[PDB]
Design a protein around this motif. Structure first.
Motif, PDB file in Angstrom:
ATOM      1  N   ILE A 681       6.956  22.812   3.979  1.00 31.30           N
ATOM      2  CA  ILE A 681       7.716  21.858   4.834  1.00 31.30           C
ATOM      3  C   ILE A 681       6.776  21.236   5.869  1.00 31.30           C
ATOM      4  N   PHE A 682       6.902  19.933   6.083  1.00 24.70           N
ATOM      5  CA  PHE A 682       6.154  19.285   7.167  1.00 24.70           C
ATOM      6  C   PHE A 682       7.112  18.668   8.170  1.00 24.70           C
ATOM      7  N   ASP A 683       7.204  19.225   9.368  1.00 29.50           N
ATOM      8  CA  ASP A 683       8.084  18.639  10.385  1.00 29.50           C
ATOM      9  C   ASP A 683       7.328  18.668  11.715  1.00 29.50           C
ATOM     10  N   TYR A 684       6.275  17.840  11.790  1.00 25.84           N
ATOM     11  CA  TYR A 684       5.494  17.809  13.023  1.00 25.84           C
ATOM     12  C   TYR A 684       6.208  17.149  14.211  1.00 25.84           C
ATOM     13  N   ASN A 685       7.239  16.330  14.003  1.00 24.68           N
ATOM     14  CA  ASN A 685       7.944  15.751  15.152  1.00 24.68           C
ATOM     15  C   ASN A 685       9.261  16.479  15.438  1.00 24.68           C
ATOM     16  N   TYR A 686       9.399  17.669  14.825  1.00 21.57           N
ATOM     17  CA  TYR A 686      10.518  18.607  15.074  1.00 21.57           C
ATOM     18  C   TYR A 686      11.873  17.917  15.087  1.00 21.57           C
ATOM     19  N   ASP A 687      12.094  17.028  14.125  1.00 21.17           N
ATOM     20  CA  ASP A 687      13.405  16.369  14.102  1.00 21.17           C
ATOM     21  C   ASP A 687      14.327  16.905  12.994  1.00 21.17           C
ATOM     22  N   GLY A 688      13.845  17.926  12.258  1.00 25.32           N
ATOM     23  CA  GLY A 688      14.622  18.620  11.229  1.00 25.32           C
ATOM     24  C   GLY A 688      14.581  17.794   9.949  1.00 25.32           C
ATOM     25  N   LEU A 689      13.776  16.735   9.921  1.00 28.69           N
ATOM     26  CA  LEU A 689      13.725  15.857   8.769  1.00 28.69           C
ATOM     27  C   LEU A 689      12.298  15.715   8.198  1.00 28.69           C
ATOM     28  N   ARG A 690      12.187  15.553   6.884  1.00 25.98           N
ATOM     29  CA  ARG A 690      10.870  15.518   6.253  1.00 25.98           C
ATOM     30  C   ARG A 690       9.942  14.453   6.876  1.00 25.98           C
ATOM     31  N   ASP A 691       8.729  14.860   7.149  1.00 30.54           N
ATOM     32  CA  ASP A 691       7.704  13.922   7.645  1.00 30.54           C
ATOM     33  C   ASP A 691       7.200  13.027   6.538  1.00 30.54           C
ATOM     34  N   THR A 692       6.909  11.779   6.905  1.00 33.70           N
ATOM     35  CA  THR A 692       6.114  10.920   6.040  1.00 33.70           C
ATOM     36  C   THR A 692       4.636  11.301   6.275  1.00 33.70           C
TER      37      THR A 692
HETATM   38 CA   LIG Z   1      10.062  15.293  10.807  1.00 27.88          CA
END
Ligand SMILES: [Ca+2]
Ligand SMILES: *[C@@H]1O[C@H](CO)[C@@H](O[C@@H]2O[C@H](CO)[C@@H](O[C@@H]3O[C@H](CO[C@H]4O[C@H](CO)[C@@H](O)[C@H](O[C@H]5O[C@H](CO)[C@@H](O)[C@H](O)[C@@H]5O[C@H]5O[C@H](CO)[C@@H](O)[C@H](O)[C@@H]5O)[C@@H]4O)[C@@H](O)[C@H](O[C@H]4O[C@H](CO)[C@@H](O)[C@H](O)[C@@H]4O)[C@@H]3O)[C@H](O)[C@H]2NC(C)=O)[C@H](O)[C@H]1NC(C)=O
Ligand SMILES: Cc1cc(NC[C@@H]2CCCO2)n2ncc(-c3ccc(Cl)cc3)c2n1
Ligand code: NA
Ligand code: NA
Ligand SMILES: [Zn+2]
Length: 808
Positions: A681-692
């Motif tokens: 999983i990549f969620d570097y902006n901690y928004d619970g949604l997949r990172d681009t």
């Molecule tokens: Ca994200």
């Protein structure tokens, strides 16, 4: 300014509030110090109390009375709720047998069954069993209608975040009500329980049910009530509104009770003083149902009885003090109590440092009753990070405890025996749901669910289209007799490639080596079959996950596992494999310890390389399909493919290797086989949604290999465990987790001990719903089963909590 010289004559509890400086007569005017001068006299009559008595029967109408017992009261819609019982020989609603409500039985002019939400503050789920003797009306609603054993609140398990989650279907991080106290650094403004700032519209995000209804032409009663309006008057006001003409009458209403929370704080959740507030709530329910029966609406209205959170035993003497850990206590601000939030006292002080604050609070005392987290490291199931009003430093407080800054805060500010706010998995914080009416099922028990799901259902009960929210619409269809919402599966956006052998080993310059050249029409006809997918029915049990975004990826088949390999991220999005109850664990042979093998189906340009790991001193690698669980010595080589490798910090490899070597087999033993899907999983902006790809903040040094923030696994088996996971004819059982991918094990205070003492505890803390993994990955699972799509939606919202069974 309010010109309170106007009058409430003919305006009592008027439905649209008037703008300043005209005086108000609505159910919130008291809260704003803004009611007309005659509001008490006209709108809060109390004379003669709330019940008809024999001698009032047929009385001459006296407009002074709180409610009426005269012949005209039914047409006026203002009888006492017990009028027909006392004066017309009728029975109480609770005394009537229950009789299924197969269709709505409504008076002429009703377009739809109205919805009444009866919300109770601090009503702990076990009260339904423990207080059953003193709540006959509530017990009848529960036994005749649809009920869950409990309903899970959102975190933090405070009042406003949960009531507004009920109203919006959103996590607190999204609706913006993230605690009962908040600072918004953009507004530079503070929100408090007491005061007028909390009324400013800018705090309240999303779209609550009353606005959704209004925008779609369904009228709504005002949900909120000034605390000094007594409960009997709230009920009488709802009943009066239900007598309005069709074109003015609302379709949705709410009652709210400050009990039993109020007394629970003072006496604890099971204090002997708690019996009375439960009796009183039940009496209020009784009044509403008798009043609906008088209006001939008791087989027409859908009634929801719902709590915001439970209540736990908490006392003064179970307080941790940050002054026992930190020297610099006066340079921080703490939001205290059953959770902690820390920020700098002054933005002008550049010696404040979150990293050293966290280190001074981490595993410092043997029995420490709180654990500090940077908000992005909290368990993803809490969904508590993506909002500027949530402070970077968070303290998760053990149930039964408080945290405070200094001892003086606790005695110069015991007084209390109960509180709430804790992790929403904790048994004492669970609350209640009952649904009763023509649109709910009859005598039906449904599994526990989360309160973020209710908004969708309330919109269904009213024929409304929900605004975008965090519920999974269709997951609560099993509560409803009719008005179900019939969702369809999302469309796959990217189709996979199915690569064959396309590259020679010598085209690869990855700095990888393997001792595999220790090298037959029987066993080479067979290996071609496995690479074409001949065992895929065994390892991919519920269809391939669908990829719901635009990307380029390959399906790779193997004897023991199948994967969807991303050419963009250089690693699998998902890896699927089945482990039967009989499977054996083997070791990684010494000569293969460091073996990594080029995958001739995938180009060197779309592969990871071993040299990047050699040169990255912080970063090592693991495998998604574990080599320990290989079906044979020969199949084992497949597990060392460069396309099965993922980057892992060494500290994380301890956790992962234990899960793969020890735990998967244990689950297969216990559950009669499991199917596992794992991935990054990549969620570097901690928004619970997949990172681009352009959101990735860390790569393996010198490469384009992105480092995951988390690793997930979804572990599915047959709900009837007499059937093996790979031959299951009915409902499924699932548990999942989203483990943080961290370079240390500072979260686990017992980590210097053997993995058998701390790893599984860590995984349990990071338990997750399949739906949480879906958001974080842009994948859709369970696409091909023999089950109904609604049933699968319910499975995907399931959370395995690891709490004991509710009741002792
Ligand atoms: Ca994200
Ligand atoms: C749970 O469910 C919710 C609701 O579906 C999901 O939240 C939504 O997520 C999407 C995707 O990120 C957001 O889309 C973006 O929308 C903005 C426009 O934002 C405004 O309009 C909408 C619509 O009426 C409002 O709801 C927004 O309200 C937010 O901000 C106000 C303050 O202004 C506040 O009152 C609310 O509480 C709310 O705050 C929360 O969301 C914001 C982000 O919007 C966040 O900063 C905050 O911390 C809170 O969590 C708002 O008034 C639009 O401008 C964006 O476009 C940008 O990105 C695109 C990428 O395509 C770029 O191309 C472009 O250049 C832009 O820069 C987004 O499209 C949506 O707003 C948001 N809705 C809500 C109510 O939160 C969650 O994702 C779900 N959670 C999980 C785990 O699934
Ligand atoms: C956030 C919030 C606050 C609140 N009272 C607070 C204000 C301040 C002073 C008096 O009123 N109430 N009352 C009822 C509800 C509610 C009922 C049903 C549902 Cl479904 C959702 C919310 C609610 N929600
Ligand atoms: Na090697
Ligand atoms: Na390394
Ligand atoms: Zn409370």
């Amino acid at each position: 300014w309010t010109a309170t010289s106007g009058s409430c004559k003919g305006r009592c509890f008027e439905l649209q509030e008037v703008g300043p400086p005209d005086c108000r007569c609505d159910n919130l005017c008291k809260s704003y110090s803004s009611c007309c001068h005659d509001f008490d006299e006209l709108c809060l009559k109390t004379a003669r109390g709330w019940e008809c008595t024999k001698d009032r029967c047929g009385e001459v109408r006296n407009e002074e009375n709180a409610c009426h017992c005269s012949e005209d009261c039914l047409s006026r819609g203002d009888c006492c709720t017990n009028y027909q019982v006392v004066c017309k020989g009728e029975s109480h609603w609770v005394d009537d047998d229950c009789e299924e409500i197969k269709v709505p039985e409504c008076p002429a002019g009703f377009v739809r069954p109205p919805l009444i939400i009866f919300s109770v503050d601090g009503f702990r789920a076990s009260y339904m069993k423990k207080g059953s003797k003193v709540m006959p009306n509530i017990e009848k609603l529960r036994s005749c209608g649809t009920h869950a054993p409990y309903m899970r609140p959102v975190y933090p398990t405070k009042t406003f975040p949960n009531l507004y989650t009920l109203a919006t279907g959103l996590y607190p991080e999204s609706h913006g009500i993230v605690g009962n106290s908040m600072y918004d650094p953009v507004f530079d403004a503070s929100f408090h329980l007491r005061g007028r700032e909390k009324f400013n519209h800018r705090w309240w995000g999303g779209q609550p049910l009353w606005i959704t209804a209004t925008k779609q032409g369904v009228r709504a009663g005002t949900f909120f009530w000034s605390v000094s309006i007594p409960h009997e008057r709230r009920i009488l006001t709802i009943l009066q509104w239900l007598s309005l003409p069709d074109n003015e009458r609302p379709s949705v209403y709410a009652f709210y009770s400050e009990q039993p929370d109020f007394s629970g704080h003072k006496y604890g959740p099971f204090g002997p003083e708690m019996t009375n507030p439960l009796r009183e709530i039940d009496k209020t329910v009784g009044q509403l149902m008798d009043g609906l029966k008088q209006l001939r609406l008791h087989r027409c209205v859908n009634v929801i009885f719902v709590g915001d959170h439970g209540m736990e035993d908490v006392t003064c003497d179970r307080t941790e003090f940050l002054s026992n850990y930190l020297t610099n206590v006066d340079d921080i601000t703490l939001v205290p109590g059953t959770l902690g939030r820390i920020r700098a006292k002054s933005i002008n002080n550049s010696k404040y440092d979150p990293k050293t604050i966290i280190a001074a609070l981490t595993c410092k005392k043997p029995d420490q009753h709180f654990k500090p987290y940077m908000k992005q490291h909290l368990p993803k199931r809490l969904h508590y990070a993506n909002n500027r009003r949530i402070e970077d430093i968070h303290l998760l407080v053990d149930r039964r405890w408080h945290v405070a800054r200094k001892p003086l805060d606790v005695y110069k500010k015991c007084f209390f025996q109960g509180d709430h706010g804790f992790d929403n998995k904790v048994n004492s914080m669970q609350t209640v749901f009952v649904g009763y009416g023509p649109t709910f099922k009859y005598r039906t028990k449904v599994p526990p669910f989360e309160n973020i799901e209710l908004y969708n259902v309330m919109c269904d009960l009213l024929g409304l289209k929900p605004a975008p929210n965090n519920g999974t619409h269709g997951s609560l269809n099993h509560l409803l007799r009719t008005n179900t919402f019939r969702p369809t599966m999302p469309d796959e956006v990217s189709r996979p490639n199915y690569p064959g052998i396309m590259y020679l080993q010598s085209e690869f310059d990855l700095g990888c080596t393997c001792d595999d050249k220790v090298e037959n029409k029987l066993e080479e006809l067979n290996k071609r079959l496995h690479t074409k997918g001949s065992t895929k029915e065994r390892h991919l049990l519920y269809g391939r996950p669908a990829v719901l975004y635009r990307t380029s990826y390959d399906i790779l088949y193997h004897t023991d596992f199948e994967s969807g390999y991303s050419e963009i991220f250089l690693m699998p999005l998902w890896t699927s494999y089945t482990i039967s109850k009989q499977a054996e664990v083997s070791s990684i042979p010494e000569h293969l310890t460091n073996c990594v093998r080029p995958d001739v189906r995938v180009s060197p340009g779309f592969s990871q390389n071993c040299l990047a790991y050699k040169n990255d001193k912080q970063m090592s690698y693991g495998f998604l399909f574990p080599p320990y669980l290989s079906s044979s010595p020969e199949a084992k080589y497949d597990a060392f493919l460069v396309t099965n490798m993922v980057p892992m910090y060494p500290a994380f490899k301890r956790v992962w290797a234990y899960f793969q070597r020890v735990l998967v087999k244990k689950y297969a033993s216990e559950r009669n086989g499991v199917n596992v899907i794992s991935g990054p999983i990549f969620d570097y902006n901690y928004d619970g949604l997949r990172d681009t790809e352009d959101e990735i903040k860390q790569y393996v040094e010198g490469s384009s290999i992105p480092v995951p923030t988390h690793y997930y696994s979804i572990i599915t088996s047959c709900l009837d465990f007499t059937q093996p996971a790979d031959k299951c004819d009915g409902p499924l059982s699932v548990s999942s987790f989203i483990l943080p991918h961290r370079p240390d094990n500072d979260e686990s205070c017992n980590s210097s001990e053997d993995e058998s003492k701390w790893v599984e505890e860590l995984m349990k803390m990071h338990t997750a719903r399949v739906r949480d993994i879906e958001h974080l990955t842009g994948l859709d699972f369970y696409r091909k089963t023999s089950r109904s799509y609604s049933e699968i939606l319910t499975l995907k919202t399931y959370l395995h909590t690891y709490e004991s069974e509710i009741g002792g």
